[PDB]
Amino acid sequence: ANPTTIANEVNTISTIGFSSEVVRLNYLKLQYKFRHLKQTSEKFYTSDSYIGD
Amino acid sequence: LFDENYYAKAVANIIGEVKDPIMYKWFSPDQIEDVDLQMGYQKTVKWDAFLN
């Protein structure tokens, strides 16, 4: 509220309030799956230019 | 070879006087890559991924 004028005697004074805010950040873990050629089988697909089917 | 082929020796001596082509200015140093053949065809393969 508005400030209180200090004149003569007074007991009721205006107040200053305080507040707290909690801020939260969430995280998410995600995954992908992909197919590939086997290391031992790479020799059976290693062509001159390309190295995959 | 140079003691036998006077034409080859002359080509080797005169190759320096030839100026560089102007097409080099049109491309960046990384854009030009020499290959090894004279006549025929070559094939290039480009791989790209996507999410399903």
Side-chain angles (χ1 to χ4, degrees):
Chain A
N2 303 305
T4 288
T5 307
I6 303 303
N8 289 355
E9 300 171 0
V10 64
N11 272 346
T12 314
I13 314 299
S14 289
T15 55
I16 294 178
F18 298 106
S19 67
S20 59
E21 289 165 59
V22 180
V23 194
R24 199 180 67 175
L25 289 187
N26 284 311
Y27 295 72
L28 212 62
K29 188 176 188 177
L30 309 178
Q31 190 174 66
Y32 286 159
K33 183 216 295 189
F34 66 105
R35 48 185 299 186
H36 56 114
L37 284 176
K38 190 175 185 55
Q39 188 267 329
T40 67
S41 304
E42 287 177 1
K43 60 178 59 181
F44 307 118
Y45 298 111
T46 305
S47 176
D48 179 61
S49 307
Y50 49 102
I51 191 167
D53 192 357
Chain B
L1 170 74
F2 283 170
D3 298 0
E4 310 174 1
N5 201 355
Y6 161 74
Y7 299 119
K9 191 176 184 180
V11 161
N13 295 357
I14 207 71
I15 194 60
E17 303 193 0
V18 189
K19 302 175 182 176
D20 292 331
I22 79 183
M23 66 184 178
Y24 288 178
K25 300 156 43 185
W26 308 336
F27 296 111
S28 67
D30 205 6
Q31 270 182 298
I32 295 173
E33 186 187 2
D34 272 356
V35 300
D36 194 358
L37 73 164
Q38 286 185 356
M39 169 177 204
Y41 64 93
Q42 298 260 296
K43 267 175 157 48
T44 61
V45 188
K46 173 186 165 187
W47 283 103
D48 195 5
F50 57 85
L51 313 176
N52 288 111

